[PDB]
């Protein structure tokens, strides 16, 4: 069973932890990857009720199992905060335009 389901993409807690770790490291070092500069601030315009405090940062999680290193980020993201706490897993899949919905 999937711990997080984003559309047809299936993720386990291990997938999420691995992606989060890579993203948080880049954030700590003040570096970015990709044309859209990840990780970067996630403003939460959607208004999700996260259990952890802001600021939030978004980092792509890939269905391939690889850690994001550039190119297309796909539709899925892991959102973490300043204390490397997981806020949640979100996706563009099933959402209008460039909005997000939570992965179930
Ligand atoms: N939908 C949405 N996009 C946000 C939010 N905060 C920042 N963004 C950015 O606005 C764009 C929405 O797809 C993305 O930028 P990017 O295209 O540079 O990756 C996304 O990172 C937010 O809370 N909601
Ligand atoms: Ca996996």
């Amino acid at each position: 069973a999937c711990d997080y389901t984003c559309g047809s993409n299936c993720y386990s807690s291990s997938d999420v932890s691995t992606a989060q770790a890579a993203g948080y490291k880049l954030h700590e070092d003040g570096e970015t990857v990709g044309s859209n500069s990840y990780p970067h601030k996630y403003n939460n315009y959607e208004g999700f009720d996260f259990s952890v405090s802001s600021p939030y940062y978004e980092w792509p999680i890939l269905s391939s199992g690889d850690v994001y290193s550039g190119g297309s980020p796909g539709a899925d993201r892991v959102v973490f905060n300043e204390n490397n706490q997981l806020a949640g897993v979100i996706t563009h899949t099933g959402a209008s335009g460039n909005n997000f919905v939570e992965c179930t």
Side-chain angles (χ1 to χ4, degrees):
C2 313
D3 285 314
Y4 297 97
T5 301
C6 308
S8 62
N9 291 331
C10 184
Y11 300 112
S12 67
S13 291
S14 298
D15 291 329
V16 184
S17 291
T18 298
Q20 188 181 152
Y24 188 72
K25 176 187 170 51
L26 281 168
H27 171 68
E28 289 200 295
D29 295 341
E31 296 174 324
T32 58
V33 294
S35 61
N36 292 138
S37 300
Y38 294 103
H40 62 235
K41 198 184 173 165
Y42 176 68
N43 302 123
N44 194 22
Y45 292 144
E46 281 77 9
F48 295 123
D49 53 10
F50 297 136
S51 295
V52 302
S53 301
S54 60
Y56 304 120
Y57 300 91
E58 69 171 277
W59 174 252
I61 180 166
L62 313 179
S63 59
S64 65
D66 291 343
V67 170
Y68 183 71
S69 62
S72 185
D76 312 331
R77 310 282 184 272
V78 294
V79 178
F80 58 88
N81 73 0
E82 212 62 55
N83 299 147
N84 200 188
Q85 296 178 290
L86 177 66
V89 183
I90 60 178
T91 182
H92 282 304
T93 299
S96 305
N98 285 124
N99 290 316
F100 289 100
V101 287
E102 287 184 280
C103 299
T104 58

